[PDB]
Amino acid sequence: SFPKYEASRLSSLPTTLDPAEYDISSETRKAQAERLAIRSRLKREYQLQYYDPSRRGVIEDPALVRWTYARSANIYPNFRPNTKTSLLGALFGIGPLVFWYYVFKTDRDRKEKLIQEGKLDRTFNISY
Amino acid sequence: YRHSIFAFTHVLIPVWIIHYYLKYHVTTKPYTIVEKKPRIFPGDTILETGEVIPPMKEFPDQHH
Amino acid sequence: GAHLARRYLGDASVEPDPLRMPTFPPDYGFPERKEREMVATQQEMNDAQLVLQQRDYCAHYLIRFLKCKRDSFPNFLACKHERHDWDYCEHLDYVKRMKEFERERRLLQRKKRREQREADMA
Amino acid sequence: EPYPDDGTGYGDYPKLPDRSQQERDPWYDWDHPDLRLNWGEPMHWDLDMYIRNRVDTSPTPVNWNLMCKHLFGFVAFMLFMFWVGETYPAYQPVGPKQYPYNNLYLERGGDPNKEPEPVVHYEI
Amino acid sequence: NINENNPLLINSIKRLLIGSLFAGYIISNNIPPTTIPQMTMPYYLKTTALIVTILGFILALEISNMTKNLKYHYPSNAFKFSTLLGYFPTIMHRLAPYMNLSMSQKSASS
Amino acid sequence: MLKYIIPTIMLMPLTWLSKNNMIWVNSTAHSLLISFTSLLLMNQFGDNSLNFSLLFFSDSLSTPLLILTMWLLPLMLMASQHHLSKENLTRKKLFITMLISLQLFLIMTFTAMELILFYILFEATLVPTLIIITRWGNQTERLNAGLYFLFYTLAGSLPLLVALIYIQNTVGSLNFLMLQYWVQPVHNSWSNVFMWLACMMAFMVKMPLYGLHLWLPKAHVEAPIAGSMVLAAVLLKLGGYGMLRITLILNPMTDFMAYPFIMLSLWGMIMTSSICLRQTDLKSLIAYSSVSHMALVIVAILIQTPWSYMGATALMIAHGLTSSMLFCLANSNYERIHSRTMILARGLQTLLPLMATWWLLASLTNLALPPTINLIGELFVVMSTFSWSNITIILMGVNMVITALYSLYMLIMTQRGKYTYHINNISPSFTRENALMSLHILPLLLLTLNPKIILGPLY
Amino acid sequence: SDAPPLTLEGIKDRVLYVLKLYDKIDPEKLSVNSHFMKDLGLDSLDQVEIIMAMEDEFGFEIPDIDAEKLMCPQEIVDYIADKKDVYE
Amino acid sequence: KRLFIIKPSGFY
Amino acid sequence: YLTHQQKVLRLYKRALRHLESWCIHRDKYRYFACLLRARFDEHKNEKDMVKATQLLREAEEEFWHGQHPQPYIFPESPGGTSYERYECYKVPEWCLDDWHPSEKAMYPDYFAKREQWKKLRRESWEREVKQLQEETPVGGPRTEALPPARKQGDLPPLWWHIVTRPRERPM
Amino acid sequence: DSWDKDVYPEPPRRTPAPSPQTSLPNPITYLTKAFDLLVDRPVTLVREFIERQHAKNKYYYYHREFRRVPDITECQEKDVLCMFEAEMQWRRDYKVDQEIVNIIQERLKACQQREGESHRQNCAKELEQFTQVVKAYQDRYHDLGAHYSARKCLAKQKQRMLAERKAAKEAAAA
Amino acid sequence: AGGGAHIEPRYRQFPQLTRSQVIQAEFFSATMWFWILWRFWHDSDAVLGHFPYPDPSQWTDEELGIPPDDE
Ligand SMILES: CCCCCCCCCCCCCCCCCC(=O)OC[C@H](COP(=O)(O)OCCN)OC(=O)CCCCCCCCCCCCCCCCC
Ligand SMILES: CCCCCCCCCCCC(=O)OC[C@H](COP(=O)(O)OCC[N+](C)(C)C)OC(=O)CCCCCCCCCCC
Ligand SMILES: C[C@H](CCC(=O)O)[C@H]1CC[C@H]2[C@@H]3[C@H](O)C[C@@H]4C[C@H](O)CC[C@]4(C)[C@H]3C[C@H](O)[C@]12C
Ligand SMILES: *C(=O)CCCCCCCCCCCCC
Ligand SMILES: [Zn+2]
């Protein structure tokens, strides 16, 4: 009897406490076999070029190109204006600007009112 | 010798330059160097004038 | 301290208020009362350039001590005689403050008995 | 498994486990030991945020939920007690310290022309 | 290879060892006075600092003796709170970076 | 200004009549000499500007931007020698011609005395700039980055032309000196609200303003090294120089019209600084940095205080040298690994020791470590905005924290960690590369000893 | 850094010296190439205990993946020697 | 015992 | 994938390290070192694949409840305060080919003997390619283990970087 | 000599004569003697050598003087020739007025350091003069803006005069 | 590190010391204890108490000027 481990998005579930690591059938044991098959094919391709003595330069990894491309170029063509995006854009795009305007607008109006009435201390203020 | 060489090219020469720099260029301008006037205690003579400050009154002395 | 409990875990009107003391006229309870004298004039303290927090009645022992250190340089172990004199002078002044605090406590407590005596018969 | 087709602009890029690079096995002969990555492996969409010098999602000895309670509980209790003690100051049974010459009127830059209200301290 | 016999190591420590003893007396006796030290107080306030320091060794010494006993150990929440720095690093250094770095990508940029 | 205009023209004959193998030696040597004589413009007076003729004049605001302008051309020629090493000779000489012509229009833009003449040269810089981006760019997007750069600028400039012509009819002249004495208040009316927008939106686009900055990441990234250097050092400051000049004839309407643009800039620099924290491209991280820095210049100009104007002037000079240097630094890596990804090549301090010292100096200035002029320019702006409103210190403080984070993150990613194993072409730093960086940092760190020469006319 | 290097002779001496202190292994049956399982008759658990003693001897961890493949002292000496660029 | 230390070229 | 036995073996190693951290003292640690071993020894004979595994999950879950919050880590192990400390002094071998000719002249023997390896590498490279592509199944390798050389004068395929890695204390 | 003390007054010094009361030597006194000889003495020899060189070549420069010209109040509307000179004169006086506020600040800062713990009572004379100059500066050269000019300063004064004129009118009205 | 008198490391044994090393360590420790004792004798009040602390509950009503409850 122990306190069952609680996992958040910033604290993964320990592999030791994961039940998925014990219900080991032929399929689960077979799936990991496929992974190491693909992971093995890529390793061979990288090692053949890496150890080549006639090669000088940079080994262009196609995976790196795809990652960056998805981050910058492929975003917009896969964007559809719908409820989630429209409100998120207005909430984050426009919400901060309206919030700050009234924060500063109110502050300066209040300060200006005091100055015109002589109630604000500017005895030595000669640098603006 | 090694300390002698270092004590000359790293201590003696810079103070010649620093003192020369302060004496004839910094001190010649107003308020560049400002000294806190020394504390004057009762019963002392002034070098500039020779004035004698009166001593304090008679304390009700008691050794405790 | 200990009197703190008497104020927080107890009545406060019968306890001095350090931010409002004293609460009775100085002449009260001391016919033809005397006063403390400054043995060092302001010009002497000004010339001595003492910190404003040290411009108390216990000054003129500090001034003598500062003179000893200036003259007795570089012998910093000496002048121990003046330090104790200024320390004890400070201690006596501190105690005289305690008398005011305890004087305040007694007078307020007296006002407590007086109110009961005068108000009960009313 | 691609990201949901919600239109935020993910396309068909893979959705990998939200695991920091700090968790990956350090003993395996990674092609990129610093990144703990492998040549050709599909990179997590947020890979740059999950490098070892940034957000770490490794398991913790104390549950995440409990850790917040203990941290929040301690700080709040400390703040309250400081507020409690502010109203109940500690001090000694000493009266106001007395100073001469009208409570040092002329020492604090007081105006000489306007004569100060007399202040006199009596013996005790 | 325990070997402290080295002039560079000994000389450096030797000076701080000398300074750690006589520095306080020298400094405290030469600096001009700029306060009014409170030299009168109850015996329980003129020696409180020394007592608690002695109490610390008393509790610290006895507790350190209990470590040699062949008695098992309990996991204490008040123990893991101290060991893990109160969880302030473990939380603030995963929550704040995550909140900021996500807003920079999902919201600010994309 | 003919003593500087005419020599700048003679560079074009010099390049074409020089030997085949001396185009780079001749052009670099003589353009440096032109820069040396540019120091004669510092003959400034406390009461009156320096007026040469009816066409050109120079004051404490134009002078620092002119010396920066003429100083950059020799550096741009050095930065271009690699990727143009194997170019057709008649195209190497057209590339240098465009650079020379761009300087020619710039030296006349800042000294222009009449705003319409300023407008023509202000607009003439698009032509040589657009050609460089689209002709000698590398990626496929250079075509789509010239379009974004072109129509963003014209969309704002075209309304500006109508506003300037209207002003001359109403006032009589666009001579800047005459405006100083014939300036009239701008009464609040719907017609004057759009006169204000026309006069300013042309320069807000070039700063650029947050929300009108989309042309900058495309233009600054696809452009060659020389294009990025000039784009991020001088052409950004044409917006700042214009606003400093034209705000004279827009008071008192600037008091309330300046609110929506201050918030876009105050909040804009937090958003754009945050983007830098999550950039997969190294040359794109530097591009977004400039937008954040120029937000302080936009805010500084609108609040219209002597401290802000002093701060704004020194920030544009500070950013011009710093931003150009960062582009050069990121370009040196590109010429080896030939890829702009930031995380492709790491641990470069192990392989290129000295080159990792210029990075440190570049990053320290970029985050405004005192007493560098970068900090002086930023510091004065913060002081001015505090008087404007105490609350702005919150946003200034927050942006400072983020500014150091994306600056040191750039330094740590590329210059530390473990060198990428599969890269074996990191050759030792060339003298051309090392000398290029020294000509940025060294003149930048000397301006701290005598900073008054870059504090503008209100000093 | 003031720590004398490690020679092949020294490492092998320390490996055998550590095992000779093990109560479940007879020194006479213990040799350079005395397999822990097929010659000295030890279970896998006792094999792990050997490594833990070995690690504390040389003060450096050995991964479980590479520790489980060490079954005789000669192999262990190879792994330690290679891990620290020991050649002579 | 002196061992060769590999470093990047320092001449340039 | 890990075998059931390996996971138990892994847990046995981890528990002792955490146990050692709590106990500190050798004799106190030594006493409990056998007590934990006793708990593992008794359940050696359990031959039920379901019951035996169920014991492991509780064993893992008891350890996580009793692990040291600050376990002792060896200085150079991942997490210890020497991990990757000297990675900044490790320069790849190929950096030498960029040395100035006058800079190489200071070590005539080292670079002369360097050409033997580079010559050896070029000579052996093509053979290493042929050896791997005949032992490689049609669909490519299914595991990352590599074969050794199977002749006289041949070197193991893909050996250069394994052999020529920087030392652990290169400076 | 170096400066006119009237502009930067330096109150007369009063140093106390030494009164040693101990048998130990005073290291300060003996160190001072060595400094005066090892360090100070050669410097004066070097300086005096240069001073003689300056005696041979002795040339002069002059503090420029500007004759006054009509102020902006005397200029017709849109008279650039008259407006220009009035505008330039205002800027030059503006530069000078900035320097006066520096001079008074320098005296104030110097006094605080000279008086030690007694500054709050002894420098009140300097502080009074500091407030008067600062208030005068603020009235004339504040809130003008980056594009300040003679016309702007004049328009500010006229506004202040109207407010001052009306306040006295109302005050004497009741 | 390099320099200083060299001592051969020992295996499973107490390390070698030197006369100079051990002697110097003892002297400072003895110097510490003399300092505490000498200071304690001359400056006992510095750790025990400077001056006696008065007791308020012994002062009289006439020195404190407390008028009688009657008036
Ligand atoms: C990357 C994520 C993006 C982050 C976005 C930026 C953060 C936004 C935070 C939310 C907005 C909160 C601000 C709310 C509006 C300001 C209202 C306010 O409280 O102003 C206080 C003060 C105003 O001064 P006053 O002249 O007295 O005016 C009175 C107004 N009632 O104003 C001031 O005097 C200025 C006070 C400056 C405070 C220091 C800056 C805050 C950060 C300090 C570090 C955190 C420590 C906080 C505790 C110490 C408090 C200084
Ligand atoms: C007027 C003031 C008087 C002074 C005395 C006051 C009482 C102080 C008691 C301290 C006891 C001590 O130090 O506990 C020492 C112990 C253990 O130490 P160990 O045996 O070395 O480690 C044990 C190692 N095992 C288990 C392997 C053998 O750690 C602790 O408890 C952890 C810190 C407790 C902090 C509790 C206060 C903070 C509350 C907020 C949430 C934590
Ligand atoms: C004085 C000091 C150590 C002396 C000692 O043995 O105690 C020695 C050690 C190395 C010396 C320094 C180095 O040799 C570098 C410089 C060499 C030249 O002789 C000029 C001074 C120079 C800067 C030397 C000054 C001084 O003599 C040094 C600093
Ligand atoms: C009161 O003026 C200061 C607050 C008291 C702090 C000291 C607390 C210890 C006194 C209680 C214990 C006394 C019995 C030994
Ligand atoms: Zn190239």
PDB file of N, CA and C in Angstrom, chain F residues 61 65 110 118 122 203-204 206-207 234-247 294 297-298 301 309 312 316:
ATOM      1  N   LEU F  61      22.197  65.480 -35.820  1.00  0.00           N
ATOM      2  CA  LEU F  61      21.423  64.273 -36.078  1.00  0.00           C
ATOM      3  C   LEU F  61      21.837  63.600 -37.378  1.00  0.00           C
ATOM      4  N   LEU F  65      24.676  59.620 -38.478  1.00  0.00           N
ATOM      5  CA  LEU F  65      24.141  58.667 -39.445  1.00  0.00           C
ATOM      6  C   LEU F  65      24.925  58.689 -40.748  1.00  0.00           C
ATOM      7  N   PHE F 110      20.193  61.962 -45.816  1.00  0.00           N
ATOM      8  CA  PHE F 110      20.314  62.514 -44.474  1.00  0.00           C
ATOM      9  C   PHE F 110      20.643  63.998 -44.498  1.00  0.00           C
ATOM     10  N   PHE F 118      14.169  64.994 -49.784  1.00  0.00           N
ATOM     11  CA  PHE F 118      14.368  63.874 -48.875  1.00  0.00           C
ATOM     12  C   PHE F 118      13.479  62.699 -49.260  1.00  0.00           C
ATOM     13  N   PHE F 122      14.729  59.206 -50.208  1.00  0.00           N
ATOM     14  CA  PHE F 122      14.168  58.222 -49.291  1.00  0.00           C
ATOM     15  C   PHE F 122      13.516  57.075 -50.047  1.00  0.00           C
ATOM     16  N   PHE F 203       6.967  56.186 -42.121  1.00  0.00           N
ATOM     17  CA  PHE F 203       8.162  55.920 -41.334  1.00  0.00           C
ATOM     18  C   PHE F 203       7.951  54.823 -40.303  1.00  0.00           C
ATOM     19  N   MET F 204       6.720  54.643 -39.823  1.00  0.00           N
ATOM     20  CA  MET F 204       6.437  53.523 -38.934  1.00  0.00           C
ATOM     21  C   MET F 204       6.683  52.195 -39.636  1.00  0.00           C
ATOM     22  N   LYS F 206       8.942  51.530 -41.877  1.00  0.00           N
ATOM     23  CA  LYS F 206      10.362  51.259 -42.065  1.00  0.00           C
ATOM     24  C   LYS F 206      11.108  51.006 -40.764  1.00  0.00           C
ATOM     25  N   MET F 207      10.528  51.349 -39.618  1.00  0.00           N
ATOM     26  CA  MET F 207      11.242  51.169 -38.357  1.00  0.00           C
ATOM     27  C   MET F 207      11.594  49.715 -38.081  1.00  0.00           C
ATOM     28  N   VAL F 234      21.261  51.004 -41.616  1.00  0.00           N
ATOM     29  CA  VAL F 234      20.977  52.356 -42.081  1.00  0.00           C
ATOM     30  C   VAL F 234      19.536  52.494 -42.555  1.00  0.00           C
ATOM     31  N   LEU F 235      19.066  51.550 -43.370  1.00  0.00           N
ATOM     32  CA  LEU F 235      17.738  51.698 -43.954  1.00  0.00           C
ATOM     33  C   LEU F 235      16.647  51.645 -42.893  1.00  0.00           C
ATOM     34  N   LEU F 236      16.860  50.898 -41.808  1.00  0.00           N
ATOM     35  CA  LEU F 236      15.920  50.959 -40.695  1.00  0.00           C
ATOM     36  C   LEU F 236      15.881  52.350 -40.083  1.00  0.00           C
ATOM     37  N   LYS F 237      17.010  53.054 -40.089  1.00  0.00           N
ATOM     38  CA  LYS F 237      17.101  54.352 -39.440  1.00  0.00           C
ATOM     39  C   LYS F 237      16.549  55.483 -40.295  1.00  0.00           C
ATOM     40  N   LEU F 238      16.225  55.226 -41.564  1.00  0.00           N
ATOM     41  CA  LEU F 238      15.547  56.245 -42.356  1.00  0.00           C
ATOM     42  C   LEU F 238      14.164  56.538 -41.799  1.00  0.00           C
ATOM     43  N   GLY F 239      13.508  55.537 -41.216  1.00  0.00           N
ATOM     44  CA  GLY F 239      12.265  55.801 -40.516  1.00  0.00           C
ATOM     45  C   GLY F 239      12.476  56.647 -39.277  1.00  0.00           C
ATOM     46  N   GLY F 240      13.521  56.344 -38.507  1.00  0.00           N
ATOM     47  CA  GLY F 240      13.800  57.130 -37.318  1.00  0.00           C
ATOM     48  C   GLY F 240      14.200  58.554 -37.643  1.00  0.00           C
ATOM     49  N   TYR F 241      15.062  58.730 -38.646  1.00  0.00           N
ATOM     50  CA  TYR F 241      15.473  60.073 -39.034  1.00  0.00           C
ATOM     51  C   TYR F 241      14.291  60.884 -39.543  1.00  0.00           C
ATOM     52  N   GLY F 242      13.417  60.261 -40.333  1.00  0.00           N
ATOM     53  CA  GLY F 242      12.254  60.974 -40.832  1.00  0.00           C
ATOM     54  C   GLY F 242      11.324  61.423 -39.722  1.00  0.00           C
ATOM     55  N   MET F 243      11.041  60.535 -38.767  1.00  0.00           N
ATOM     56  CA  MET F 243      10.134  60.892 -37.683  1.00  0.00           C
ATOM     57  C   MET F 243      10.721  61.993 -36.811  1.00  0.00           C
ATOM     58  N   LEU F 244      12.027  61.942 -36.543  1.00  0.00           N
ATOM     59  CA  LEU F 244      12.654  63.017 -35.784  1.00  0.00           C
ATOM     60  C   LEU F 244      12.514  64.353 -36.498  1.00  0.00           C
ATOM     61  N   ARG F 245      12.522  64.347 -37.832  1.00  0.00           N
ATOM     62  CA  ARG F 245      12.422  65.595 -38.581  1.00  0.00           C
ATOM     63  C   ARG F 245      10.982  66.071 -38.708  1.00  0.00           C
ATOM     64  N   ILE F 246      10.053  65.165 -39.007  1.00  0.00           N
ATOM     65  CA  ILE F 246       8.703  65.581 -39.364  1.00  0.00           C
ATOM     66  C   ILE F 246       7.798  65.792 -38.156  1.00  0.00           C
ATOM     67  N   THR F 247       8.164  65.274 -36.984  1.00  0.00           N
ATOM     68  CA  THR F 247       7.374  65.544 -35.790  1.00  0.00           C
ATOM     69  C   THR F 247       7.407  67.012 -35.398  1.00  0.00           C
ATOM     70  N   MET F 294      14.101  48.635 -32.251  1.00  0.00           N
ATOM     71  CA  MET F 294      13.488  49.808 -32.857  1.00  0.00           C
ATOM     72  C   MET F 294      12.188  50.208 -32.176  1.00  0.00           C
ATOM     73  N   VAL F 297      12.970  53.090 -30.118  1.00  0.00           N
ATOM     74  CA  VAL F 297      13.161  54.293 -30.919  1.00  0.00           C
ATOM     75  C   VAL F 297      11.817  54.886 -31.316  1.00  0.00           C
ATOM     76  N   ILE F 298      10.853  54.040 -31.680  1.00  0.00           N
ATOM     77  CA  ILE F 298       9.522  54.540 -32.010  1.00  0.00           C
ATOM     78  C   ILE F 298       8.890  55.197 -30.790  1.00  0.00           C
ATOM     79  N   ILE F 301      10.639  58.601 -29.875  1.00  0.00           N
ATOM     80  CA  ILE F 301      10.362  59.753 -30.725  1.00  0.00           C
ATOM     81  C   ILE F 301       8.999  60.348 -30.401  1.00  0.00           C
ATOM     82  N   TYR F 309      14.998  62.100 -27.078  1.00  0.00           N
ATOM     83  CA  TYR F 309      15.637  62.398 -28.355  1.00  0.00           C
ATOM     84  C   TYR F 309      17.135  62.138 -28.298  1.00  0.00           C
ATOM     85  N   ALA F 312      17.184  58.340 -28.280  1.00  0.00           N
ATOM     86  CA  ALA F 312      16.821  57.775 -29.575  1.00  0.00           C
ATOM     87  C   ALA F 312      17.979  57.863 -30.557  1.00  0.00           C
ATOM     88  N   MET F 316      20.019  54.449 -32.311  1.00  0.00           N
ATOM     89  CA  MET F 316      20.097  54.115 -33.728  1.00  0.00           C
ATOM     90  C   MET F 316      21.539  53.891 -34.162  1.00  0.00           C
TER      91      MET F 316
END
